[PDB]
Design a protein around this motif. Structure first.
Motif, PDB file in Angstrom:
ATOM      1  N   UNK A   1      -0.312  -2.717   7.778  1.00  0.00           N
ATOM      2  CA  UNK A   1      -0.525  -1.438   6.940  1.00  0.00           C
ATOM      3  C   UNK A   1       1.070  -0.722   7.073  1.00  0.00           C
ATOM      4  N   UNK A   2       1.414  -0.396   8.278  1.00  0.00           N
ATOM      5  CA  UNK A   2       2.446   0.322   8.792  1.00  0.00           C
ATOM      6  C   UNK A   2       3.637  -0.209   8.279  1.00  0.00           C
ATOM      7  N   UNK A   3       4.523   0.079   7.369  1.00  0.00           N
ATOM      8  CA  UNK A   3       5.818  -0.471   6.898  1.00  0.00           C
ATOM      9  C   UNK A   3       6.807  -0.895   8.229  1.00  0.00           C
ATOM     10  N   UNK A   4       6.589   0.076   9.135  1.00  0.00           N
ATOM     11  CA  UNK A   4       7.389  -0.016  10.193  1.00  0.00           C
ATOM     12  C   UNK A   4       7.092  -1.069  11.321  1.00  0.00           C
TER      13      UNK A   4
ATOM     14  N   UNK B   1       1.022  -1.176   0.185  1.00  0.00           N
ATOM     15  CA  UNK B   1       0.073   0.109   0.074  1.00  0.00           C
ATOM     16  C   UNK B   1       0.846   1.203   0.245  1.00  0.00           C
ATOM     17  N   UNK B   2       2.200   1.368   0.798  1.00  0.00           N
ATOM     18  CA  UNK B   2       2.887   2.546   0.643  1.00  0.00           C
ATOM     19  C   UNK B   2       3.299   2.893  -0.769  1.00  0.00           C
ATOM     20  N   UNK B   3       3.620   1.725  -1.740  1.00  0.00           N
ATOM     21  CA  UNK B   3       3.910   2.092  -2.985  1.00  0.00           C
ATOM     22  C   UNK B   3       2.744   2.792  -3.644  1.00  0.00           C
ATOM     23  N   UNK B   4       1.512   2.054  -3.564  1.00  0.00           N
ATOM     24  CA  UNK B   4       0.290   2.601  -4.184  1.00  0.00           C
ATOM     25  C   UNK B   4      -0.057   3.984  -3.651  1.00  0.00           C
ATOM     26  N   UNK B   5       0.216   4.415  -2.549  1.00  0.00           N
ATOM     27  CA  UNK B   5       0.018   5.557  -1.838  1.00  0.00           C
ATOM     28  C   UNK B   5       1.000   6.880  -2.172  1.00  0.00           C
TER      29      UNK B   5
ATOM     30  N   UNK C   1       0.906   8.766   9.999  1.00  0.00           N
ATOM     31  CA  UNK C   1       1.450   9.611   8.643  1.00  0.00           C
ATOM     32  C   UNK C   1       0.616   8.875   7.608  1.00  0.00           C
ATOM     33  N   UNK C   2      -0.300   8.269   7.609  1.00  0.00           N
ATOM     34  CA  UNK C   2      -1.113   7.733   6.201  1.00  0.00           C
ATOM     35  C   UNK C   2      -1.589   8.678   5.634  1.00  0.00           C
TER      36      UNK C   2
END
Ligand SMILES: CC[C@H](CO)Nc1nc(NCc2ccccc2)c2ncn(C(C)C)c2n1
Ligand SMILES: O=C(O)c1cc([N+](=O)[O-])ccc1NCCc1c[nH]c2ccccc12
Length: 274
Positions: free
Chosen positions: A245-248, A147-151, A205-206
């Motif tokens: 969801x959170x990459x971290x 999702x972080x790529x898509x966002x 941060x999202x």
């Protein structure tokens, strides 16, 4: 010509791929024809791991990569196993091996970025190997994109590969793609409808992400018991940590190898029809 092309075996994310034989060696190899980057690509030759396809040679004129050849890919194997399903011990062995490959390449600061069943190669001995790395800069399938790529995150991390591998894990179990979007927004909204629309509580941060819109619909999260039904609680726990969801907060490859799901891991041999 040094290479007698045995058969075009498809199209990778970066060029055309041939099965070929070396005329004055007899060696059977895979040839990827493509199209600074020469320097970094060349380094990959002597970083080797049992669960990473071996890069044998780099040839410049149009760019050629000579790889070891493997006889089947995981998408083909999944398709051949769809009436019966892949046995859980083999799913588990494949996932464990892929996490070893990811732990290795992540420990060397190499990302894949475009993992999909078609780029996972298997042999008759029960091994599976990561191939088709997205290392060029360093219709397209969006189904495995984090999702972080898509966002719109510009500086995404090794976590994107854990996300992709989690989607593949789920697909081996259920025999259906987890998130089969046909556009970037459809892909994002398919994720949201299953895992819930992310907010600042679960992903700080999202709402600041470059492509985040406050107008995104707010879907509730469903339960993993509904998402990959057959899978046992150890498997569902591991998958939930791979799809955070959170990459971290998403589990690392090294940490996933210690998950209780793998306490009874073995190395079965697949039944391959070649
Ligand atoms: C099938 C899609 C896949 C793209 O990664 N193609 C592929 N497929 C490979 N083998 C599976 C295959 C064998 C014969 C026909 C078609 C596919 C293969 N072996 C080494 N390589 C190198 C280039 C990474 C291989 N690449
Ligand atoms: O996989 C591909 O097809 C591919 C494509 C390109 N490319 O498109 O420029 C470049 C490299 C590629 N693979 C390298 C595999 C590899 C060997 N040793 C390693 C050690 C760490 C991480 C990875 C590897």
């Amino acid at each position: 010509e040094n290479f007698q092309k045995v058969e075009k075996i498809g199209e990778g994310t970066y060029g055309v791929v041939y099965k070929a034989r070396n005329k004055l060696t007899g060696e059977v190899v895979a040839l990827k024809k493509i199209r600074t980057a020469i320097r970094e690509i060349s380094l990959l030759k002597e970083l080797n791991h049992p669960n990473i396809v071996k890069l044998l040679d780099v040839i410049h004129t149009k760019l050629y990569l000579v790889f070891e050849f493997l006889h089947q890919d995981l998408k083909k194997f999944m398709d051949a196993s769809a009436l019966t399903g892949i046995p859980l011990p083999l799913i588990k062995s494949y996932l464990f091996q892929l996490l070893q490959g990811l732990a290795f390449c992540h420990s060397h600061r190499v990302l894949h970025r475009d993992l999909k069943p078609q780029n996972l190669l298997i042999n008759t001995e029960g091994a599976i190997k990561l191939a088709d790395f997205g290392l060029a800069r360093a219709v397209v399938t969006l189904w495995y994109r984090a999702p972080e790529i898509l966002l719109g995150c510009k500086y995404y991390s090794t976590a994107v590969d854990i996300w992709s591998l989690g989607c593949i894990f789920a697909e081996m179990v259920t025999r259906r793609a987890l998130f089969p979007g046909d556009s970037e927004i459809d892909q994002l909204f398919r994720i949201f409808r299953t895992l819930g629309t992310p907010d600042e509580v679960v992903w700080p941060g999202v709402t600041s992400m470059p492509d985040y819109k406050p107008s995104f619909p707010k879907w509730a999260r469903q339960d993993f018991s509904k998402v990959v039904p057959p899978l046992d609680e150890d498997g569902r726990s591991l998958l939930s940590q791979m799809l955070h969801y959170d990459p971290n907060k998403r589990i690392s490859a090294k940490a996933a190898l210690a998950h209780p799901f793998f306490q009874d891991v073995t190395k079965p041999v697949p039944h391959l029809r070649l």
